[PDB]
Amino acid sequence: MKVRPTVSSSRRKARKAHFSAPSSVRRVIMSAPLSKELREKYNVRSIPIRKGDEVQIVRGAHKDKEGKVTSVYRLKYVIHVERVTREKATGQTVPIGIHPSNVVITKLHLDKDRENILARIKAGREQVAKAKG
Amino acid sequence: SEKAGHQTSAESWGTGRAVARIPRVSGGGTHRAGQGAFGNMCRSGRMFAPTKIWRKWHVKINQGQKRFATASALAASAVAPLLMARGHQVSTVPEVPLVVDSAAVAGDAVAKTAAAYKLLKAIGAGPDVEKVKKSKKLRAGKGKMRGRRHRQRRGPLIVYSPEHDGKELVKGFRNIPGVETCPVDALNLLQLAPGGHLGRFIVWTSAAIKQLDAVYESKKGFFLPANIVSQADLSRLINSTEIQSVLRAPKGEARTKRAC
Amino acid sequence: NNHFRKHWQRRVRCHFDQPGKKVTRRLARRAKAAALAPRPVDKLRPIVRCPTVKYNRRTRLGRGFTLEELKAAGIPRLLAPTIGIAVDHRRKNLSEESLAANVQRLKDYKARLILFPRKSNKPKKADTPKDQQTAETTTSLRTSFGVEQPLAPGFTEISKSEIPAGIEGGAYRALRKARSDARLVGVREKRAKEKAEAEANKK
RNA sequence: AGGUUGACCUCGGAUCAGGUAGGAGGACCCGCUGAACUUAAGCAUAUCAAUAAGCGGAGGAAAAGAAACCAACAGGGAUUGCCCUAGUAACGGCGAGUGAAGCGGCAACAGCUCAAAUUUGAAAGCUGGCUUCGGCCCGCGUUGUAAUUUGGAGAGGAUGCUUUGGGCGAGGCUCCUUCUGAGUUCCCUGGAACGGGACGCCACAGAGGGUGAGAGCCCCGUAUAGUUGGAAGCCAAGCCUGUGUAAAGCUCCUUCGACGAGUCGAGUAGUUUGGGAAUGCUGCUCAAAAUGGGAGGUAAAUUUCUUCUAAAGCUAAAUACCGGCCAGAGACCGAUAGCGCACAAGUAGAGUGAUCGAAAGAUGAAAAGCACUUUGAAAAGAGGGUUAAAUAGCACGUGAAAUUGUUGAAAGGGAAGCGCUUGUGACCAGACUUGCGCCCGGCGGAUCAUCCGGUGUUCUCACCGGUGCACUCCGCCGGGCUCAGGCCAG
RNA sequence: CGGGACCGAGGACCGCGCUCUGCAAGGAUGCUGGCGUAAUGGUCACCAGCGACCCGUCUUGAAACACGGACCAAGGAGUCAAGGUUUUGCGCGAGUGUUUGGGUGUAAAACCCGCACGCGUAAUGAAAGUGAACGUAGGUGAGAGCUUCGGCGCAUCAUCGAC
RNA sequence: CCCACCCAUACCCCGCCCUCAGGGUAGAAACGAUGCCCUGAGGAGUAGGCGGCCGUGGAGGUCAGUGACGAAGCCUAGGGCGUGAGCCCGGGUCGAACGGCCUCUAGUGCAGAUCUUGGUGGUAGUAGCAAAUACUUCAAUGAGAACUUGAAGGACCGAAGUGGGGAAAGGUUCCAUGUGAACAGCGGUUGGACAUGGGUUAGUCGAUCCUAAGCCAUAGGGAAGUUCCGUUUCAAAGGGGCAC
RNA sequence: AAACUUUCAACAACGGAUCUCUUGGUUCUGGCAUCGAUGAAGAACGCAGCGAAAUGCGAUAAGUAAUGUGAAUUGCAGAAUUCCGUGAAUCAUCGAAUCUUUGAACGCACAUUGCGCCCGCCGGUAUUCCGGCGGGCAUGCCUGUUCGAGCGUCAU
């Protein structure tokens, strides 16, 4: 149960915020879990997804397919995975939109900022566990 | 809104040979022009008897009658048939009213939800807690859009003494669905008789059951009411020797033979 | 007898904000207490007797202590509002009893007062010493210095030998005679003046 | 030089140096001005109403406010607001109606500044300009700028004690920032599990939302203590220091003790009020006083008494809020509803103009929005495809009725429709299918009766373990017999 | 003593009786046949015999006149507040009413608190004012109920007294 | 005057429904006692009064309720229950929620209101598409030509024009190219329609300047004020020249 | 017999009811005090590679600077991002800026892109002519400065 007066449990306000969120908020909204190996390596459960990550689809009709993230259509709240496509009528290839909560990240596209994100998440989790323990 | 249906300029076209005498929107060049207005029978018009905020929403109830009802609900909570008739799963409960030792709840003993849930399963409220857990359903109607999405049954109410048991048991029991908590000195009829139905299943602490008498002695202007009936066992009264020895002989049977 | 002949619907005040306003008042009181700590949240008030014959049986709290009460209690009028005492320059002490009661009230407050120095490193002789500065305090002068006996006791036991004899002729007759004398005060004065004038004329 | 040379006063100029006002908003607030519909049978008193419209002026509140008060008491003691007083006192054609205040309980509390005095042993005061920031100038001002005093007093005396200025500051609070628990385990349905079943886990978090269908553990968030980094304020335990040049308080007193004028008040007129004998405001005429003046709700004279101290001024809080900004909610409405507006809505459109003012939401999880062939000038059609579904094709969820087309059945010699009752044709729901009980025969087993031990109970009834050794129990399979069985009839 | 029609309510026994091994006596059984399915039964359409004005409104006593109605969907009209009054249920009871406010809270809820106040406990008079027991709270006639069978007498009514 | 016969919701007998009335029913083997058993009588109804039930949106409780193995809604010459309002089931369609019971609550029940909004009929392939004299031939274009084009003919306006240009008003309608639908009350390849582009060149033409009828500032006076009057005034309302 | 009219049924039409949905209304509660001559509210006209509107913005024009985040935007086109970074984005924040013609609206006017005046700077052969650019010029009132007027009162 929510306690804080700044927290609203209004369904109307929640849906308005979700479907009118700006791009930086949508980046946080399209987060994906890490694989078990990455979770034990980094002590991180979930991260915002980005182009160049390698994912495994665990839900839907394209389950167990693997590939790299080729596009993050934040306007459609969807990601595109290479070779997870379908055929149009005309015989051309069109990407299939996958929600990032239906995939699991198996390889991270790493740079300095991503390492900073992972490090500060790990440090916060350890600090919280130490304080509550 | 008090201005609803009245933000229009409209006049009746008068008695004539063609149309009804409802006021009609003046002007031209739009669909609204010439259409009916202001009537409760008109589209985009004012409703009949518009609702006002000075309707009587709140009900003043005598404090003596509130105390009477709370005492009756507390007495009904100690009757095991009424708990079953209200729908609580109490077949494995060892005793009604159920009193748990305050050493099992005081301080931080059940500050964790797992510990509180384990205590409920140990004392026998587990089937009622599981009944609430399995009862969750989606509500039928517009209440889903209006912030009331789900319905579930009521579980046990844990009554505690804040002075002797503390208040961390509240945090411990809070996340379990259907389980409510209440201090012994602020008992609530809405919890003691949910939906106006008597027989709420209550788990008492020993401190709360020891403080209840002082709670009812400290209520100014109220005494526990005297009943109009001394002996509620009607069968015992009717079939006692004192009444039966003075009766007339029966003038018939439960079934009467047809004469002609 | 319904007074709904004006446009009454424009001036209907509902009170849905009653619990919210109680919450706001309690938050303001808690903020005021936190700002004033360790002083009490209110000022000391004197005991006064209500006016008119309906209410002169009962005492209550007044606005502030009089200047003569402060003088008889030894509290200067510039110091008094700085140590939580309300001052009323309009009220006078027409009788000794109210004056004495309020002077005793001020003396009890002054005896229970703990006065911290303006500079901690330089205490003065009128200031409370640090080893008396620690004691249990009250933060509600309306409670700790309330009206203890608003009314006189309605019941009292005396010995049968100490029963008063009563006014001669009876209480009812005494009331009738007092009313009659009040109605005839001027007639008797005029008659006495006329008799004196006649005696002076024909002495 | 005196027909000159100056000082002032008043009045002007300047794109002079520096400032300020206007308009918007106006829910709430302070004033002004001011109706009628209505209600009184009608209707000029009245009521609606000291309201709407109109006009001027503020703020986050405004306004009011530290008694020329209430009272008549054993007296209360600035203002505001709530409850009560109280539908009361009172006012009112031909009566419809109108209608306060003191006390009392409570919310909140906070007190003060001038004018009237000679600093007169020293205009001690101040705007502006220039500054080397030390000050120096141009002025204002004695037709009075400071200090001192404001009625609670004060001024002068007497008297002996008390009082004060700066600088640090531990720590705390307010606001943005980093970070937070647990299954995408197995089986079934499904296009997709977020459904069903199983096995777990978290919970100070089972609020809310998203994700291909009802998700605490997939994702955002949610709970609680905290934990990173930054800024600006406020409060504050304490601690260093200067001390009396000066200012300040208390106590007593012979004496002194200024206190607001075309104002108060009166008459009259209009308006207003419960104050149509007792109200307020404004205009005109008259026009004060010094223990004086005002008030003391019936006019006047005389004698008292009680209360304040007008005609100058400031001030937080408790109170209001259909405007604005931010936020949280609801036994509210669910696209003819709810705001006129859920949509490029105060839009399109109309009117010279003031103004008036709509209609209009929903493919699908995903466009996967139909490749390719064929017929047509094309729109399109047909194949063939996509989809879980095109019985979802950008006329798009569902798809009612009026009304229409086709197919099938039927009726019809100047209305049909309806009630009762047969018949014909078409089309249907039930009921029934066998059960129970005996007598034989064949199987398959010993949860037959009695007794013993334990346990439970309603305390005399049961269950469980041993005992049966098959003329006793329990099912099954073949016969035979009795009874009861559906519809219409004699 | 025949002939015919319609009907079979009830569901152990009990009763009244009689022509008394039993019965026609407080309500139908016995025997038999065909069929066991659209055969009985039902629905719809139509024909046939008989029956049958178009609804609502208005008016008066009534008709008639008059008014509204092309058809369908959705919308569409005795509500809310304040104040009285009578009746029902409930709590307490010579008292009663927490909710203006305060305390408290899991926070518009629930729980708790009390000063004042309202109404009631006294009326009457314009007012000043005064202010309810002769008596087991009276006599008499009724009166449910109780009774020790002598009476005692509720509510209420009637009538004479008292304050 | 006589005999028989016909039939009303009337009268008689019987069944069933409801209402009213009168009885029975506990040392309970005992009951939706708000029940059951026995007996009798009665049955029209406007204004009006009272009771009980049915249905709709929402709220508390409860049914360990139903549901993608198909909720709600809709259609149904298919059935069952109820005197009835209604309730329940089968079949078809469909796609995400919903219902029973006891209480609580209301913007809660339609045939009418010349009712409101929207949609749709008969009339009806009907009235009509008849002022301004009038069209015809060949060829081309095109799927298609009375109302497109070229040529060939015939006519009309008849200089107060059916001509050549402007003022007001409009605002791109102008020009070229292309064009499905819609519009051009018939057609359409055409169009002032639709689509994409292009086009308006000034010392001398106008505006700009002048004043007319008239309007508005200023000084100043009114007005509670928005503002009214005032335009030469009861205004210190400014130009030039010269200077050892 | 058909046709026609009417009735009943199935399917197809017409139409948009019903059901479910809801980034919207409505009502209540809590918090806050902040428009403008330093030019507001309002109006007009413009600005994107490809927009008419809505939205955003002002010739620095779907935006600039700064801070933060950390890889998009997306209908098409075209470019990315040294990804181990002075850095994508129709991102967030927002303290620095830009802010056309107007409008209380201010040189005078405005039914005119009309007519001026003052002071600078630049260019064109230029002491004279022409052009461009920059800064200014409303009213009432206050304080002050300075220049004045009047036998209004005086001194000399």
Automatic annotation (TrEMBL), chain A:
<dbReference type="GO" id="GO:0015934">
    <property type="term" value="C:large ribosomal subunit"/>
</dbReference>
<keyword id="KW-0689">Ribosomal protein</keyword>
<dbReference type="Pfam" id="PF00467">
    <property type="entry name" value="KOW"/>
</dbReference>
<protein>
    <submittedName>
        <fullName>60S ribosomal protein L26-like protein</fullName>
    </submittedName>
</protein>
<dbReference type="GO" id="GO:0006412">
    <property type="term" value="P:translation"/>
</dbReference>
<comment type="similarity">
    <text>Belongs to the universal ribosomal protein uL24 family.</text>
</comment>
<keyword id="KW-0687">Ribonucleoprotein</keyword>
<dbReference type="GO" id="GO:0003735">
    <property type="term" value="F:structural constituent of ribosome"/>
</dbReference>
<feature type="region of interest" description="Disordered">
    <location>
        <begin position="1"/>
        <end position="22"/>
    </location>
</feature>
<dbReference type="InterPro" id="IPR008991">
    <property type="entry name" value="Translation_prot_SH3-like_sf"/>
</dbReference>
<dbReference type="Pfam" id="PF16906">
    <property type="entry name" value="Ribosomal_L26"/>
</dbReference>
<dbReference type="InterPro" id="IPR005824">
    <property type="entry name" value="KOW"/>
</dbReference>
<dbReference type="InterPro" id="IPR005756">
    <property type="entry name" value="Ribosomal_uL24_euk/arc"/>
</dbReference>
<dbReference type="GO" id="GO:0003723">
    <property type="term" value="F:RNA binding"/>
</dbReference>
<dbReference type="InterPro" id="IPR014722">
    <property type="entry name" value="Rib_uL2_dom2"/>
</dbReference>
Automatic annotation (TrEMBL), chain B:
<dbReference type="GO" id="GO:0003735">
    <property type="term" value="F:structural constituent of ribosome"/>
</dbReference>
<keyword id="KW-0687">Ribonucleoprotein</keyword>
<dbReference type="GO" id="GO:0006412">
    <property type="term" value="P:translation"/>
</dbReference>
<dbReference type="GO" id="GO:0005840">
    <property type="term" value="C:ribosome"/>
</dbReference>
<keyword id="KW-0689">Ribosomal protein</keyword>
<protein>
    <submittedName>
        <fullName>60S ribosomal protein L4-like protein</fullName>
    </submittedName>
</protein>
<feature type="region of interest" description="Disordered">
    <location>
        <begin position="1"/>
        <end position="15"/>
    </location>
</feature>
<comment type="similarity">
    <text>Belongs to the universal ribosomal protein uL4 family.</text>
</comment>
<dbReference type="GO" id="GO:1990904">
    <property type="term" value="C:ribonucleoprotein complex"/>
</dbReference>
Automatic annotation (TrEMBL), chain C:
<dbReference type="GO" id="GO:0022625">
    <property type="term" value="C:cytosolic large ribosomal subunit"/>
</dbReference>
<feature type="region of interest" description="Disordered">
    <location>
        <begin position="183"/>
        <end position="203"/>
    </location>
</feature>
<feature type="region of interest" description="Disordered">
    <location>
        <begin position="117"/>
        <end position="159"/>
    </location>
</feature>
<keyword id="KW-0689">Ribosomal protein</keyword>
<feature type="compositionally biased region" description="Polar residues">
    <location>
        <begin position="131"/>
        <end position="143"/>
    </location>
</feature>
<dbReference type="InterPro" id="IPR001380">
    <property type="entry name" value="Ribosomal_eL13"/>
</dbReference>
<keyword id="KW-0687">Ribonucleoprotein</keyword>
<dbReference type="GO" id="GO:0003723">
    <property type="term" value="F:RNA binding"/>
</dbReference>
<dbReference type="GO" id="GO:0006412">
    <property type="term" value="P:translation"/>
</dbReference>
<comment type="similarity">
    <text>Belongs to the eukaryotic ribosomal protein eL13 family.</text>
</comment>
<dbReference type="InterPro" id="IPR018256">
    <property type="entry name" value="Ribosomal_eL13_CS"/>
</dbReference>
<protein>
    <recommendedName>
        <fullName>60S ribosomal protein L13</fullName>
    </recommendedName>
</protein>
<dbReference type="GO" id="GO:0003735">
    <property type="term" value="F:structural constituent of ribosome"/>
</dbReference>
<dbReference type="Pfam" id="PF01294">
    <property type="entry name" value="Ribosomal_L13e"/>
</dbReference>
